[PDB]
Amino acid sequence: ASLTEIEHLVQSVCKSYRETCQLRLEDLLRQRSNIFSREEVTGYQRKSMWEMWERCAHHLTEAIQYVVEFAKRLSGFMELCQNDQIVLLKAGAMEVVLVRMCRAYNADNRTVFFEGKYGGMELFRALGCSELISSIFDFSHSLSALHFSEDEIALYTALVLINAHRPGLQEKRKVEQLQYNLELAFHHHLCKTHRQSILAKLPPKGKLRSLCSQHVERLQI
Numbered sequence: 098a099s100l101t102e103i104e105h106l107v108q109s110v111c112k113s114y115r116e117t118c119q120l121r122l123e124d125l126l127r128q129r130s131n132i133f134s135r136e137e138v139t140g141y142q143r144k145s146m147w148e149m150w151e152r153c154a155h156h157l158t159e160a161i162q163y164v165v166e167f168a169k170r171l172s173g174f175m176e177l178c179q180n181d182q183i184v185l186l187k188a189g190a191m192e193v194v195l196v197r198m199c200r201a202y203n204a205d206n207r208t209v210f211f212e213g214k215y216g217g218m219e220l221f222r223a224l225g226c227s228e229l230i231s232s233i234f235d236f237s238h239s240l241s242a243l244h245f246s247e248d249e250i251a252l253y254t255a256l257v258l259i260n261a262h263r264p265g266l267q268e269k270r271k272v273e274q275l276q277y278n279l280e281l282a283f284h285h286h287l288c289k290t291h292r293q294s295i296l297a298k299l300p301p302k303g304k305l306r307s308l309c310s311q312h313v314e315r316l317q318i
């Protein structure tokens with residue numbers, strides 16, 4: 098694994114994310130002024146849990162679609178066997194989406210972009226998952242404090258997908274080979290941008306899975 102190869106890997110990863118990030122970001126930052134009025138927030142709270150769960154379920158499904166496209170555009174990922182690709186996506190797709198969401202989170206007023214405007218966590222009262230949604234707002238808040246950059250998100254969510262310790266793989270050493278090169282590109286790029294400091298400030302990652310596995314009680318696919 099040469100150096101210019103690692104620099105290519107970085108650019109190759111940052112372009113894949115730019116093409117599959119779902120929302121441009123400058124759109125997100127621009128609309129931070131577009132906030133839900135107390136009346137609009139009530140319209141969301143009066144919805145039933147089934148109405149809200151369906152809306153959200155449709156957002157995740159669409160989000161996960163962009164993550165698969167992101168994975169599908171990663172060099173090396175397509176070279177894996179089909180079993181590994183499904184194993185990795187089936188385990189990491191959701192975690193990547195949780196990390197991607199921090200971009201829609203505005204730490205100024207503790208609101209997230211949701212269907213055209215920004216709202217606080219009281220917007221999802223109908224789901225009945227007060228604690229779960231609180232935890233997500235904390236996570237997104239932690240990542241926003243770092244001023245996570247587009248390329249940092251692209252390299253990091255790549256390291257969330259390409260995890261050689263996922264159970265079910267059968268060409269493990271290939272995922273390890275790929276996982277290390279994405280760590281090299283991540284570290285290398287952080288050096289070029291004087292951003293080695295965000296490493297210690299990153300949430301572990303067992304918590305990233307903890308929000309899913311520990312707090313998820315899936316009843317719809």
Ligand SMILES: COc1nc2ccc([C@](O)(c3ccnc(C(F)(F)F)c3)c3cnc(C)n3C)cc2c(Cl)c1CN1CCC(C(F)(F)F)CC1
Binds near residue numbers: 120197212
């Ligand atoms: C705070 O809670 C949420 N906040 C969201 C923020 C943005 C988007 C959104 O889909 C989105 C916006 C920007 N970027 C992303 C991406 F990058 F993440 F893909 C997604 C979106 C919104 N409005 C539009 C037009 N869009 C596209 C969906 C969101 C959802 Cl569903 C939820 C509720 N969830 C959370 C996790 C779930 C769990 F089970 F895991 F707990 C269950 C319940």
